[PDB]
Design a protein around this nucleic acid. Structure first.
Length: 276
RNA sequence: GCGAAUUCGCUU
RNA sequence: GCGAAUUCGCUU
């Protein structure tokens, strides 16, 4: 049975105006990075009007466009694609009901020409940070090395708490004027290094390291449109989450880039709309 | 988000 | 179970 491949076209048509940028984030046009998502199906998707999703960066216009049709795929590749599809909703979004068609998969350019990113899928399956927390072996003789490039489009997790279910953060800023020896926000500890040593008994091998600003990755399920004591408490906690300053040495980098993660959170809205 | 305490509304 | 109010704990 032949396949149809669609691209989930995303463009940021109305960036979030300053008066609405409460969390004071950078805005990230999806169109700025080539890797995106597509849909692979056995039957054609009826033409559907362009529609908005309202993301953190502003209003994004979604277009579902045909990329390829009439081709075949081997059982091996379909299995790989299926696994990644399942990975997206169970491990990235942590969602039991994808649509609040058949396989979502990553596309990338080969040259400005979108096709199935098999390499990326394989990289995910080989990653030691694929599911939870990868092992490390930092010592004085083999210390942690900070490479800025690895933090530019990164999602990170703390390696030292919550291991059944790690909190994933976007790296929002790299604070090059700070180190683990900078003064700690709470007065019960003098430094970041002391905090982590006293609380978790963690030793640092690198004391020249920049520190990181973060932005939680959590997103509401329905983004198709742009209160309570409970919502207050939740917003307060999110504010504190976002005030956290993390030590790169103490975090692991997730194999899914930040730019793709931002597109992932739109998927349920889009699949819901398609099934309507 | 994960938990806790106190108080109040909806049923006959 | 469906809701609401007030207060407190967990992150740096």
């Amino acid at each position: 049975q032949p396949c149809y491949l669609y691209v989930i076209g995303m463009v940021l048509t109305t960036p979030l105006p300053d008066e609405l940028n409460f969390r004071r984030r950078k805005l990230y046009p999806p169109e700025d990075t080539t890797r995106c998502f597509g849909i692979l199906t056995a039957k054609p998707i009826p033409q559907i009007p362009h529609f908005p999703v309202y993301t953190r960066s502003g209003e994004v216009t979604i277009s579902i466009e045909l990329a390829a049709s009439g081709f075949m795929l081997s059982l091996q590749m379909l299995e790989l694609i299926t696994r990644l599809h399942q990975y997206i909703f169970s491990h990235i979004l942590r969602l039991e009901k994808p649509a609040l068609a058949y396989c979502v998969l990553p596309l990338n350019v080969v040259s400005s020409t979108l096709d199935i990113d098999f390499k990326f899928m394989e990289d995910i399956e080989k990653s030691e940070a694929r599911i939870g927390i990868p092992s490390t072996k930092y010592t004085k003789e083999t210390p942690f090395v900070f490479k800025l490039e690895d933090y530019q489009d990164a999602v990170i997790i703390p390696r030292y708490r919550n291991f059944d279910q790690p909190h994933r953060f976007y790296v929002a800023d790299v604070y090059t004027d700070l180190t683990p020896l900078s003064k700690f926000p709470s007065p019960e500890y003098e430094t970041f290094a002391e905090y982590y040593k006293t609380k978790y008994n963690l030793d640092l091998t690198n004391l020249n390291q920049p520190l990181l600003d973060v932005d939680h990755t959590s997103s509401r399920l329905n983004l198709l449109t742009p209160l309570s004591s409970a919502e207050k408490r939740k917003a307060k906690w999110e504010s504190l989450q976002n005030k956290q300053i993390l030590v790169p040495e103490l975090c692991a980098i997730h194999p899914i880039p930040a730019s793709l993660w931002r597109k992932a959170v739109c998927l349920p809205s889009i699949l819901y709309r398609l099934h309507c």
